[PDB]
Design a protein around this nucleic acid. Structure first.
Lengths: 386, 63, 136
RNA sequence: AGGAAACUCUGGUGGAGGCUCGUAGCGGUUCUGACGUGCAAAUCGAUCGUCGAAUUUGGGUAUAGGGGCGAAAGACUAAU
RNA sequence: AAUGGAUUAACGAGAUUCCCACUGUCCCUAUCUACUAUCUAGCGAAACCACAGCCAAGGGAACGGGCUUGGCAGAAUCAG
RNA sequence: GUCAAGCGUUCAUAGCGACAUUGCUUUUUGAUUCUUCGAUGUCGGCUCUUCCUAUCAUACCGAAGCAGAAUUCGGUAAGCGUUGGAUUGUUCACCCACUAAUAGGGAACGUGAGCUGGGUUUAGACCGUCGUGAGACAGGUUAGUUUUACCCUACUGAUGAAUGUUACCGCAAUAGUAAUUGAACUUAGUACGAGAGGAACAGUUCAUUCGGAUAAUUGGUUUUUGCGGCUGUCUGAUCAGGCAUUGCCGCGAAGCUACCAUCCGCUGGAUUAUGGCUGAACGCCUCUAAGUCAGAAUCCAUGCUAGAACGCGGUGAUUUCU
């Protein structure tokens, strides 16, 4: 017999299975569409989610009521030290898909990245890539031909890069490593560009620019084994109910005499791969610079790191990003940035953004002061201030 | 933009941070924090509360 | 709103569901307004339609004049008592929740208003602006 | 104290009631809670009824099976 | 109409309706605590049991775990 | 559905369509009694998924006794959605109101080791009628124990031997899939209409429903038993503390969390219906027969989720005085 009063599917089934990811570093499924008219350049980036904060700016959409008025917006901050390019691989295409035929690395490597190759590093000979360097230590002994092979073949190229987890304030010492597709120019140009960029930093001033809409790709925060009621948004059953109300009551009919997949069920919430899009960048900023927190309107020399620091992160002394809104992922976590796939204009992706003020107050409480100068000014001296 | 002054503590209210209250007599109060808000709802006197600017300036401290 | 939506509205946090009694602010004879419906309301299962500031509604009078009592009438909210958030992030709330009788088009059957109102309603319903003492 | 009188009222004492609130206690409404292969062959918890009596109770004593006892439910008569 | 009728103050863990208050009953859920479950050491039952345990249609005692035709099919397993 | 006397100002067919007639469905109710009486837990609601379409709305279209608006009929279409309440145990019905619209139904009349137990459906009891009486009444009322999963499967999540070992980077078979609807301004009081009234596409800003994240802000939560205070009591008094099933209050960070907060929610192709291009048969003509164009909430891809644990690839290091 039919459902007496209608209502929709609780939850979304495209996002199934709701299971723990394969990694703490979300796979980038898809990059943009390669084009040759442009120059060779990256199409992605890596950083570490630091936290959120709040800003002020003057909206401009001709027809709103806050047109040419102030707003206040929640932004999310990423610490993006420049990634060390080492290596590239070449993907030839088959009816069975793209396929790597070669992975060319660089001669010299950092302890962080070969640590990522290792697990127990403190008891190790640190024997890695030595015979690769000895394939190096000559002009081109067994490298030039791999490169020219990649030139003769390999419709697609992906550059291997790694992060600077020691430049971060974290406590890992184990670099993150990944690939990025290049979507510019020709293949020979891509590979020689990468050869030039072996062992070399690359930075966000080169990959991105303000008022660009992007995708944030990351793994969403783990919440353990969880009931159906938070995991799906199901109605709490009523008070008088023997044996539990944080449940689904019927989980299927007599026939088919099975539990349908679409029914809700308890289990893992979080640590899930997610790919959110259309996150306008509001500011690139520099580690090797002060006044990161200061707009043209404020001009009070102050960086972005609030008083007492980011909660669970620390400081932003590297190059960093401020993007509108939330993103998948929690603090201290990796994040994979990405150019869009589609030239969304919409009078929302083109809205040019200039900022006014940036909350650099303490998130470890309810902070009244953006600066200890301001603090001492408002308060006067103190007993400790001899 | 501008910054404002808690009715109770007399503190700068940077934009968004804090609550606002509009009594039936159209008096618009602002509160940096639920602390001040809750005291206000308790109908306390900041001149009697010690950490407040009013007590500070009424006892002539930081002159 | 719909009909008398002089422009648009931004969402406001919702605190006045059906069953809510809210004060009447105007000079129409009333004392209270029992909300029973909302215009432009959403249709979801075992969800109570909730009113807002500016939301026209259908209401009844449980207390007041026997010409107004025992019949529905359109009414408009001007006060909410539920902290909502404007685009400048200011979280603001009144102490009370009230409204005013109207016609379907939005013109107050009453000729005045007793207290403060919301700038959203004042910008969306011009007759309320006309009969407004103070706005915020 | 008032009143013409008839007789009416006021303050106190005093300490009645199959009265009342409410503990012990006797019970056992609701939660149709807990448990429901139990602590338990009927309990645990909170909430409840009543609490000086047509009260509660020990011990002795009488009534024995188509019989007994029953403020009466076909209830009880050694988990029957 | 003492197979009692019609009222009836007071009383009722009686049945019922409405109003005030109140409220997480609810819109709409969230959070916290102790005991569990969980893992360990040690102890250590029971119910139940043709054989066992993947679906669809068919026909068939007219609603198959088994037969028929198909789909499929990869050790051993933990929590629920 | 067929047929069409008639209605429809005139006209059978725009729309209806009596008398007659052919079929379908099993959502009723009968009829039957095949299974089931060494028991298949028995109405409804709640919850929750999935399916059909005989499509209520939404997408695109055709016809009209369609000027416009509004409406009616019909096609592809079940992608997507289909409410809140009053009374009733109710299915159903009837009303109120919003609504884009508030369509019908199935899954053992879906679903009780999922709830509840109003109703029905034991035992107590009351009334009425029937009965000499004990007693009867799908007649009415009231009170009346809702047991067990630790096994297998299914399901959700989670490990995992074996592939020469180990680590890293990848591919992507297959499966899943999602975004939905409305309003306002403008177009425009224009078109259209004698007048009355009264559109539309594009554009902009907003919202409904659903989803996926996040916790800067606000709110909540508070065993931070962090700070302060309060009562009773104990420690000779003070200072500082214990007990009060976390003693109580106010504040309360962090963390968790909220349409109670915020942010985001893609674009290309083939197609249906339909309208058509050339075009014969049928020396004309015809969207069709060969060929062919555009065309939808459709379909498939883009994209998104998992990654075959018996699908694969690339790369690094590969044990000695064992």
């Amino acid at each position: 017999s039919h459902r007496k009063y209608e209502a929709p599917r609780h939850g979304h089934l495209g996002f199934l299975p709701r299971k723990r990811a394969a990694s703490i570093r979300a796979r980038v499924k898809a990059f943009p569409k390669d084009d040759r008219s442009k120059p060779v350049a990256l199409t992605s980036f890596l950083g570490y989610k630091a936290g959120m904060t709040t800003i002020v700016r003057d909206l401009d959409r001709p027809g709103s009521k806050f047109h040419k008025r102030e707003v206040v917006e929640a932004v999310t901050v990423v610490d993006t030290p420049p990634v060390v390019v080492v290596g590239v691989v070449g993907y030839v295409e088959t009816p069975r898909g793209l396929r790597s035929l070669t992975t060319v690395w660089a001669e010299h490597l950092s302890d962080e990245v070969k640590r990522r190759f290792y697990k127990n590093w403190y008891k190790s000979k640190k024997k890695a890539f030595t015979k690769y360097s000895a394939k190096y230590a000559q002009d081109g002994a067994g490298i030039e031909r791999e490169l020219a092979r990649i030139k003769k073949y390999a419709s697609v190229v992906r550059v291997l890069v790694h992060t600077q987890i020691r430049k971060t304030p974290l406590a890992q010492k184990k670099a993150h490593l990944a690939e990025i597709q290049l979507n510019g120019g020709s293949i020979s140009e891509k590979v020689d560009w990468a050869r030039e960029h072996f062992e070399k930093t690359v930075a966000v001033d080169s990959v991105f620019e303000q008022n660009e809409m992007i995708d944030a790709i990351a793994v969403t925060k783990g919440h353990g084994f969880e009931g159906v009621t938070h995991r799906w948004g199901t109605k709490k059953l009523p008070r008088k109910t023997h044996r539990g109300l944080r449940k689904v009551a019927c989980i299927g009919a007599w026939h088919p005499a099975h539990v349908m997949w679409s029914v809700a069920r308890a289990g893992q919430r979080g640590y899930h791969s997610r790919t959110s899009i259309n996150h306008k960048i509001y500011r690139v900023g520099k580690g090797d610079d002060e006044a990161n927190g200061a707009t043209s309107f404020d001009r009070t020399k102050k960086t972005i790191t609030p008083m007492g620091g980011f909660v669970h992160y620390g400081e932003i002394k590297n190059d960093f990003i401020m993007v509108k809104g939330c993103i998948p992922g929690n603090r201290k976590r990796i994040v994979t940035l990405r150019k869009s796939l589609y030239t969304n204009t919409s009078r929302k992706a083109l809205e040019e953004v200039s900022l006014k003020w940036i909350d650099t107050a303490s998130k470890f409480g309810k902070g009244r002061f953006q600066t200890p100068a301001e603090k001492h000014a408002f308060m006067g001296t103190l007993k400790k201030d001899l | 933009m501008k910054v404002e002054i808690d009715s109770f503590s007399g503190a700068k209210i940077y934009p968004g941070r804090g609550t606002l209250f509009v009594r039936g007599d159209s008096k618009i109060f602002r509160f940096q924090n639920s602390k001040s808000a809750s005291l206000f709802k308790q109908r306390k006197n900041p001149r009697r509360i010690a950490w407040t600017v009013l007590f500070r300036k009424h006892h002539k401290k930081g002159i | 709103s719909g009909n008398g939506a002089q422009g648009t509205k931004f969402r406001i946090s919702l605190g006045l569901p059906v069953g809510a009694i809210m004060n009447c602010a105007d000079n129409s004879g009333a004392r209270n307004l029992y909300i029973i419906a909302v215009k432009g309301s959403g249709s979801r299962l075992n969800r109570l339609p909730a009113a807002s500031l500016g939301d026209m509604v259908m209401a009844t009078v449980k207390k007041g004049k026997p010409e107004l009592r025992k019949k529905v009438m359109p009414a408009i909210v001007v006060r909410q008592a539920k902290s909502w958030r404007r685009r400048d992030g200011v979280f603001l709330y009144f102490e009370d929740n009230a409204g005013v009788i109207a016609n379907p088009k939005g013109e107050m059957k009453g000729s005045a208003i007793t207290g403060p109102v919301g700038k959203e309603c004042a910008d969306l319903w011009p007759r309320v602006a006309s009969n407004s003492g103070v706005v915020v």
